[PDB]
Each structure stands twice: as C-alpha cells, then as structure tokens.
Amino acid sequence: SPTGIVLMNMGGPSKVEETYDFLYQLFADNDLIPISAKYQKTIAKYIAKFRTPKIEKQYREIGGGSPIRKWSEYQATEVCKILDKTCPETAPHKPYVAFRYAKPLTAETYKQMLKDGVEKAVAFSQYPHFSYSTTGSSINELWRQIKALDSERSISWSVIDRWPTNEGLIKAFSENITKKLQEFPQPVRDKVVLLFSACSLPMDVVNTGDAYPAEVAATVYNIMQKLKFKNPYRLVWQSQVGPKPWLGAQTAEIAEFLGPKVDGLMFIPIAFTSDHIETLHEIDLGVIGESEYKDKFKRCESLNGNQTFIEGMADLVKSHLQSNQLYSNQLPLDFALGKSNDPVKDLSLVFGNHE
Amino acid sequence: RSPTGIVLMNMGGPSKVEETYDFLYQLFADNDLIPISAKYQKTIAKYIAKFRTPKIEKQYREIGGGSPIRKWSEYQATEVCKILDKTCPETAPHKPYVAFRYAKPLTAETYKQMLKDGVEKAVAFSQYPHFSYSTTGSSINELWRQIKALDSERSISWSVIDRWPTNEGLIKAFSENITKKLQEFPQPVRDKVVLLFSACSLPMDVVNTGDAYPAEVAATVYNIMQKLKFKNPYRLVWQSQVGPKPWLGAQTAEIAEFLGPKVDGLMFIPIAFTSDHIETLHEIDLGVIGESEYKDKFKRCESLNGNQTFIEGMADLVKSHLQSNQLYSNQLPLDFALGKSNDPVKDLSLVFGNHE
Ligand SMILES: C[C@H](CCC(=O)O)[C@H]1CC[C@H]2[C@@H]3[C@H](O)C[C@@H]4C[C@H](O)CC[C@]4(C)[C@H]3C[C@H](O)[C@]12C
Ligand SMILES: C[C@H](CCC(=O)O)[C@H]1CC[C@H]2[C@@H]3[C@H](O)C[C@@H]4C[C@H](O)CC[C@]4(C)[C@H]3C[C@H](O)[C@]12C
C-alpha cells in the first residue's frame, strides 16, 4: 500500500515544443474560458495556433523551457524522501506531479498511479493560496478523472487545498528577502520597498467571493512580521490580460510610477513556489530589463529547492495525513461560491474511501 | 504638568440629526475622498449636501437619533488615557481628545482646544486599524493644514499611529465577540456558521493605486481566524458600495443573499471599524439582516465599542508607540507616494516631530 503525493498546479511546458497542446488545453477549459456551448474544443484550436508563436518566443527568451515540471518533481521527491522517514505508517510515499494544462496532465498521471499500485493519494495543490480558478479547477478535473479512470473507487483521495502561512514557506521567503536585500548599497537597504507580486485574477472571480486575494495578503503580512517591518512593502498583482477589469495595482505600473521615486525596489514571487514564466520573463526581462531604473530593480530568489522550504512542505503533508481529514473546512464554502459549468457537487463523494 | 494629547481620529458621524448637513458638506467637499473638480468642489458639495441631507437624516432617526461614533470615540479615549496614566507616568497626565474628519468636533475645532489647553506633545491616533489614503491619508492632510493654519510656531509636537492591523487586544476582542455571538446559534449548526468579515469597500480606482487598505484588513481577518483555530468557514467581504463605479467585492449584501438558502447561519463581523455606526446599526442590522428572508439564521457580531480587551489593547498600542520614538510607520512615506490628492502632505518629517 504505497501513498501517492501528487503536487498539482496549472503547469507550464517543459519544452518549447509543448506550447501548442498546453495552450489548447487552457482554451479548451470549460469553467474559466467563456464557453460558446459545446464548442471550446473547436474554437480552442483556432486560438492556440494564433497565440503559439508569441508565447513560444517567450519560453525561448528564458532558455526554451518552463521550469515548473522539474521543480515540481524535484520538490515532490525530497518531500517523500522526508515523508518516508517521517511518517512510517504511510510509507512508501511515491511522488507524483499532475498539471491542469501542461504535461503530465491529470489523466496521464492518474493511469500511472493506477498501474503503480497507489491506494491513497494526496492532491497537494502547490498553490499556498486557494483560488477557485486554480485549486478549484485542479479539483474539478480530478473528479472527472475519478469518475472515468476509476468508477469503482480504488484510490482514496484527500487534498491539501491551501497553506497560506506554513512556516517553512513564511521563513523561506524571509532569509531569501533578507539575502536579496544585502545586494543593495547598504545605506539604502531599509528603504527598498518590498513589492510582493502575485498573479492577478479577473474582478469577476474576485467578486464571487474567491479566497485568493485575502489569503495572499495573509502570507505577505506574516513575512513582514518576521522581517519586523524593517522595510516598506505593498502587495500588488501581475499577469493581467484580456479585456475585463482585473485586480488591484498592476505590478508593472506600480514599479514605473515608483522607479524615479525610490532608492530601489524588490520583487517577490509571493504566490508560487518555483521559477516559471512569471518570474524569468514578466519580471526579469519585462518589468526589470525593459526599464531605465533596472539597476535599482532587483528580484528575490524563487523558492524552488530551498531546504527550509521543502522541510516546511514535509511537515505540512505529515500533519495533513496524520490528522486524517480530507479537506479544509473552507472548501465547501469555496465550491458553493465558485462558478463552473461542471463542478464537484459533493466533496464527501470525491475524497475519502468509497470502494 | 503639561498634558500630552491623545487624539482618536476617524471620519466621525453626526451626533444629532441637525449636524447631518454640516457633516455631509464636509464629506463631499473633501477632494481626497470623492474627487469632483479641482476648483468648484466646495460649491458642488453645498448642493449635494442640501440634496441628500433628508435621506441620511431619516436613516439616523431610524437607528435612534444619530451616530454613536462620537460617544464611543470619547469613551475609548478616556478609558485608554486612564490606563496610560498608570502605564506611562513619563508622559502623564494623558488628556483625551477626539478629532473627526467631517463630524464635530472637527480637527480644526479640536486643535484649537489643544493649543488652549497647553498640549505640547500629541499623538494623532487613527482609529482605523487599516490604513487607507481616503480616510487616514486624508485625515493626515487635514492635520497638516491645521498645523499651518493654527500653529505656525509648532507649539505641538505630533506623531501618528497610522495603522495597527494585528494589535493583540483587537484580535482577541474580536475573537471573544465572534465566539460569543456564536453561542446564539444552536450547536449542531455552530461550526457551519459562515463568518462573513464585512469591511467597508473601496472604489476600484482607489484600490488600483496600491492603497494599503484591502490587504491590511485581510491580515486582521486571518489573525482572528488563527485565534479561532479555523473552526468555522469564513470570507472577507465588502459593504457600503454605492452607485455606478466598480467597487471592491464581493459585496456583503449580494453574497449573503446568494449564500442564504445554502447556509445554516451567517455572522457579519464589523471588521474595519471599532464601534457601532451607520454601517452596523442601519446597513447591516436593518438592511442585510432586517430585510432578509433568512433573517433568523442571520446574526451580527457585537461591535468592539467598550470592550476592555480592546481598550487595554489600544492602551498598549499607544504605550508602545510613545516608548519608540517612531514618528510614523515605515509604510507612511509609501502611502503618500501612491496616494492621490490635490493638496498632499509632501514631507511627513515636517508634519510630525518637533519643529518649534
Ligand atoms: C459656473 C461653473 C463653471 C464656470 C467655469 O469654470 O467654467 C459651473 C461648474 C459646475 C456648476 C455647478 C454644478 O453644476 C452643481 C450645481 C447645479 C445647479 O444647476 C446650480 C448650482 C450648481 C452649484 C452649479 C452652478 C454652476 O453651474 C457651476 C458652478
Ligand atoms: C451621501 C452619499 C449618497 C447618499 C444617498 O444615496 O442619498 C453617500 C454615497 C456613498 C457614501 C460613502 C460610501 O458609502 C463609503 C463611506 C462609508 C462610511 O461608513 C461613511 C462615509 C462613506 C464615505 C460614505 C459617506 C456617504 O453617505 C456617501 C458618500
């Protein structure tokens, strides 16, 4: 009886070649992308090819790959290597990764787990901050992928659906921020403004009651507490695209408006745990590199393989499994408020034993 | 001994219905709050306040004859100053003042009282635990103007407590009231009651300036939910939205009606102010709750008001501020860099500190 530890997120293409199919999946989405009716399938192809050149340039501009997959797997591995030493009752812990839109997709990793012999599996959403658009979709696909590949409930699932202030996280973001603050002249240090940048969200998700904005803010404040508020800081938002209004102080505009007003400025990837397109591209090449004030624009190191961070992830799964609950008590609220053309309508059915 | 001045500050409300017109004119004249026109803001304010005064006036008669803000402010100042007198003998006697941005006594009024009383050291104590430029930033700008206008000698040395989202007593007091209000729900349904932390909302173009408010409210929310051990589901929501512009949501009213038939109970927690006011006694008590069909599984958490744990926590907040010689937090220069104002402070180190 081995235990599946499944790191989940929306993923990125490990290689430039995987960009079309990645995009197709995203635009084929039920929930998020505006549904014609049945016709995502069709029209999603008609936009993936349209947008595949531009996003391909980008991934090539950072080394021809999204680092999400390697970093997901690597994390999932050291987690289980501590897990198998820390929770014997649960061992063996077999690491897995399953992305909502990149490879390996949810179906592709479910069948691997089924041939592999896992009996209970932990859907460990790699987002410390639940949003229905992220950790909701990843769950709602898992349900579809449970009714298909497993209509007689061989694998018993739970889900770590958020962890905004796990202390390995909070602590790893400090130290990192402090050590990235030491790259600054030193008479400036304490006046560098820590700009915490989270991927944004349409206002129409925000206005449903989504948990994501406040849960990000909880992580920021906890960091600044351990930093004893040495520095100024603001939580701002990046990655706005499309025509509808999105959330709150666009990261790029704030840095411009501040550039000629500040001795310096640090960017913090507050809402993801490894480098990906948002860090290596949008900030490094896009917000920092295309800027006059680039010499005072520095970015804090992403979490990735941070020893302190991975151990904090370890104790999180450790304490999730040993306290034997299937999901946080926010999750029924999350799904009652979220909007989706095909939703989990009972998380009791989805997680736990049902053979 | 000379007294050191402890000045609770917030927008205020009209103590009596006859102050409604003055209060509304003050509010609609404040271009930091509702930007209409560089030049004619104060004539236009005159009109709007003539127009909307009888509607607001009836609303206050419906909750009992006026805003209890002033009463609770002055009561908190007094109870806090009397803790400081035992706590901070070095700056005793502590003399309590209140100064409201639009109500009476206004900040000009309260300043003049302070000069006359001989105060030489004063703390602008913003009663908002969550800084917003349109409340605390605007209030700081008002104080600068009264600095120049009434006190060019710089008789008064000012500091400001410009925020305090996770003061311990405030967290605790909220947790005690939430737990206490939850006793009024049966028990098999208690852990299912949804705690809706309801904060007054922001126009999105204010949010989009990088205003500090929404994220700081969320810090209080999460800290409270930590003290409660996440026993209940909770969401942070926003009320008091008006009119055409997109505001921050979700909206308290529409979230409660959507959730109504799906929930065992809703609790509304007045997370962003410290006493009863129109928001709680009218908009929540009478509107979202009084007029709902699920109104018997709807309850509001008691405001902090005179809560001792909250008052003791405010006392420590001031005591810690005095014994620190911080004129203001490390956030304030950033607040002012991003805030939008036609008459901003510009140079907070001239505003606060000795310049006698
Ligand atoms: C005359 C002045 C514009 C002069 C100018 O700068 O060109 C205009 C600008 C906005 C106007 C005001 C606003 O429209 C609000 C009020 C509207 C009422 O019709 C009369 C008084 C009232 C207060 C107006 C008086 C006058 O029409 C104002 C004051
Ligand atoms: C008086 C005016 C319109 C009243 C009416 O509909 O008749 C209303 C519309 C928006 C209101 C404001 C916003 O709702 C937000 C703030 C909420 C605070 O509780 C009081 C001041 C506060 C700044 C409000 C004061 C005032 O009553 C306003 C300005």
Side-chain angles (χ1 to χ4, degrees):
Chain A
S1 315
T3 318
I5 300 321
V6 192
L7 273 60
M8 284 148 85
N9 60 74
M10 309 283 100
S14 47
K15 266 313 296 169
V16 190
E17 297 87 287
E18 303 184 353
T19 298
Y20 171 72
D21 217 61
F22 172 74
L23 278 152
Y24 167 60
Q25 282 314 300
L26 206 142
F27 293 107
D29 202 312
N30 259 16
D31 305 338
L32 274 82
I33 291 307
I35 314 287
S36 309
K38 49 222 175 309
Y39 266 84
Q40 293 266 322
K41 52 213 222 150
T42 37
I43 318 305
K45 325 180 113 185
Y46 163 99
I47 320 196
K49 71 91 194 204
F50 175 111
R51 285 198 124 181
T52 291
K54 162 179 222 200
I55 292 144
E56 273 205 46
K57 332 188 151 294
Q58 295 225 142
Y59 283 103
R60 287 198 269 88
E61 301 193 42
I62 46 163
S66 191
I68 285 175
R69 213 200 171 170
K70 184 52 74 228
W71 282 125
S72 299
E73 304 176 346
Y74 172 92
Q75 267 143 38
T77 283
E78 308 280 339
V79 159
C80 297
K81 279 171 179 181
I82 297 181
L83 273 202
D84 267 355
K85 188 174 281 212
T86 195
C87 324
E89 56 267 79
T90 52
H93 307 102
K94 275 222 90 51
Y96 303 110
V97 289
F99 313 115
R100 177 73 178 86
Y101 297 127
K103 164 181 199 291
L105 209 80
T106 320
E108 185 186 308
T109 68
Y110 208 125
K111 34 178 299 160
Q112 190 45 50
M113 292 182 314
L114 278 180
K115 334 220 181 206
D116 260 306
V118 293
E119 309 232 315
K120 71 185 200 122
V122 191
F124 186 2
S125 164
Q126 198 131 39
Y127 299 118
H129 320 97
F130 180 96
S131 166
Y132 201 73
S133 283
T134 40
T135 296
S137 191
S138 212
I139 279 164
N140 270 323
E141 171 84 356
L142 175 81
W143 177 223
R144 290 175 213 109
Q145 221 55 251
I146 275 189
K147 303 147 54 170
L149 296 75
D150 197 0
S151 35
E152 234 198 326
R153 322 301 295 100
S154 77
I155 318 194
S156 147
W157 285 95
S158 67
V159 54
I160 305 172
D161 57 307
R162 78 209 63 216
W163 38 295
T165 61
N166 172 280
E167 204 246 352
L169 186 75
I170 296 310
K171 188 181 274 211
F173 267 117
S174 323
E175 322 190 303
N176 270 27
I177 287 160
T178 304
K179 138 179 54 169
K180 192 53 79 179
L181 271 165
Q182 310 297 299
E183 302 204 14
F184 276 109
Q186 200 204 46
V188 298
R189 214 151 269 163
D190 302 345
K191 310 197 231 82
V192 184
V193 284
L194 316 167
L195 293 182
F196 295 73
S197 173
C199 159
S200 180
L201 267 191
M203 281 309 287
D204 60 52
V205 189
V206 176
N207 279 359
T208 71
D210 201 84
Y212 175 65
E215 286 203 11
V216 185
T219 311
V220 180
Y221 195 79
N222 264 70
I223 283 139
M224 303 293 313
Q225 290 193 289
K226 193 145 210 335
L227 299 176
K228 315 178 143 166
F229 292 93
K230 202 176 78 177
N231 284 78
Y233 76 97
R234 204 51 44 124
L235 161 58
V236 284
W237 310 87
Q238 53 162 120
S239 298
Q240 295 87 333
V241 295
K244 27 178 68 184
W246 285 43
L247 178 47
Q250 219 293 337
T251 286
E253 320 189 2
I254 288 286
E256 260 323 280
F257 179 87
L258 293 191
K261 304 176 83 174
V262 296
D263 311 91
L265 203 80
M266 194 198 308
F267 298 92
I268 322 187
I270 177 67
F272 202 68
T273 52
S274 84
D275 277 301
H276 63 299
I277 185 135
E278 284 181 17
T279 70
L280 308 153
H281 206 90
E282 209 180 329
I283 303 294
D284 296 338
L285 312 184
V287 166
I288 297 202
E290 302 184 336
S291 182
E292 320 152 32
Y293 326 90
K294 177 229 193 159
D295 316 271
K296 50 180 161 205
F297 282 14
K298 257 160 206 50
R299 173 174 72 75
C300 161
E301 194 181 337
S302 284
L303 284 179
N304 293 333
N306 194 283
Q307 194 86 79
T308 310
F309 165 68
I310 318 148
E311 299 177 321
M313 271 176 110
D315 273 41
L316 169 70
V317 200
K318 158 132 188 80
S319 319
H320 157 79
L321 276 174
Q322 76 174 13
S323 175
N324 222 19
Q325 239 301 12
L326 320 192
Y327 49 86
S328 92
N329 34 31
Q330 295 278 93
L331 214 56
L333 182 59
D334 291 320
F335 280 69
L337 287 157
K339 322 277 170 200
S340 153
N341 262 336
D342 194 66
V344 165
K345 255 284 218 168
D346 201 316
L347 292 137
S348 72
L349 206 87
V350 173
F351 301 99
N353 324 56
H354 294 86
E355 64 218 346
Chain B
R1 282 87 185 200
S2 147
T4 84
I6 307 308
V7 186
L8 296 208
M9 277 142 64
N10 76 65
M11 284 185 288
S15 35
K16 58 213 274 154
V17 188
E18 300 87 350
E19 291 172 48
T20 300
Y21 174 72
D22 283 322
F23 163 77
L24 289 176
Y25 169 70
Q26 303 291 354
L27 179 169
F28 278 102
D30 178 0
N31 174 274
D32 289 334
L33 182 62
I34 304 145
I36 315 133
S37 182
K39 207 278 169 62
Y40 303 99
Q41 171 96 35
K42 84 312 181 193
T43 71
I44 302 173
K46 255 169 163 193
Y47 185 179
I48 301 172
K50 204 223 196 154
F51 224 58
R52 313 240 197 202
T53 292
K55 290 144 291 324
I56 302 301
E57 271 193 271
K58 111 174 273 192
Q59 294 191 293
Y60 271 113
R61 280 184 290 251
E62 278 164 3
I63 62 141
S67 190
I69 282 182
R70 150 147 200 191
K71 175 217 169 134
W72 286 116
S73 289
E74 295 181 355
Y75 173 80
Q76 294 163 356
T78 305
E79 284 321 296
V80 152
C81 278
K82 279 184 324 189
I83 296 174
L84 291 161
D85 277 348
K86 312 158 136 194
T87 278
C88 289
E90 63 263 31
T91 58
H94 305 102
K95 187 135 201 309
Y97 301 89
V98 293
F100 308 115
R101 179 44 222 264
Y102 313 126
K104 294 176 217 135
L106 282 175
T107 78
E109 275 146 81
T110 278
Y111 207 119
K112 296 174 193 215
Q113 187 66 27
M114 296 181 312
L115 291 178
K116 148 165 212 196
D117 302 331
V119 180
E120 310 256 320
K121 195 242 168 310
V123 180
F125 187 180
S126 167
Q127 266 178 304
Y128 303 109
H130 312 104
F131 179 92
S132 183
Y133 195 93
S134 43
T135 59
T136 295
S138 148
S139 160
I140 282 165
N141 290 327
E142 185 52 17
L143 179 66
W144 188 213
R145 269 171 255 121
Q146 302 312 303
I147 295 325
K148 293 189 259 182
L150 320 183
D151 190 35
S152 266
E153 292 92 7
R154 308 303 303 268
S155 161
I156 313 291
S157 195
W158 284 95
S159 63
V160 62
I161 306 175
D162 43 307
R163 74 200 64 206
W164 39 294
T166 57
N167 183 249
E168 239 163 73
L170 169 85
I171 304 309
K172 255 162 204 51
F174 268 125
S175 322
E176 293 174 358
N177 283 4
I178 287 144
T179 323
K180 192 141 33 83
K181 188 52 62 161
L182 269 184
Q183 304 297 23
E184 304 184 22
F185 291 103
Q187 180 283 329
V189 304
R190 215 160 270 164
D191 306 0
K192 274 222 205 161
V193 188
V194 180
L195 309 173
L196 291 173
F197 296 83
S198 182
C200 179
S201 176
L202 271 202
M204 278 310 283
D205 43 41
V206 179
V207 162
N208 289 346
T209 64
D211 205 67
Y213 172 69
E216 277 193 1
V217 171
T220 308
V221 172
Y222 192 88
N223 259 259
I224 286 160
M225 290 308 308
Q226 279 184 320
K227 273 297 189 190
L228 299 185
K229 261 83 178 190
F230 297 92
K231 190 185 164 279
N232 285 55
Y234 70 102
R235 208 50 49 104
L236 165 55
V237 293
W238 321 81
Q239 68 182 83
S240 311
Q241 290 107 335
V242 171
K245 291 173 86 315
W247 290 66
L248 187 55
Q251 315 199 344
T252 298
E254 93 201 19
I255 282 271
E257 274 309 289
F258 176 64
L259 278 186
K262 325 214 228 177
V263 286
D264 291 315
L266 293 185
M267 193 186 295
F268 301 90
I269 308 172
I271 186 69
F273 198 66
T274 49
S275 80
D276 284 319
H277 56 158
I278 197 81
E279 287 187 3
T280 60
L281 294 177
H282 201 300
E283 184 179 2
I284 295 294
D285 279 357
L286 296 181
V288 176
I289 289 182
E291 296 170 353
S292 178
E293 95 188 15
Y294 321 99
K295 77 195 254 280
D296 299 339
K297 52 191 178 171
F298 283 10
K299 282 165 212 309
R300 179 178 59 73
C301 170
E302 281 148 26
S303 293
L304 297 195
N305 287 335
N307 186 286
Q308 297 193 12
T309 298
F310 162 59
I311 284 201
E312 282 166 33
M314 264 180 313
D316 282 311
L317 178 59
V318 175
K319 170 199 165 57
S320 157
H321 174 78
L322 287 173
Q323 315 176 351
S324 97
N325 328 296
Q326 257 176 322
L327 296 188
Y328 44 81
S329 86
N330 306 305
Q331 295 287 93
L332 212 59
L334 182 49
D335 293 322
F336 273 79
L338 302 150
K340 308 314 182 207
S341 161
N342 290 292
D343 182 24
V345 153
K346 172 36 43 188
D347 206 349
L348 294 155
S349 46
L350 187 31
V351 168
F352 314 97
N354 309 84
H355 299 76
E356 319 142 74

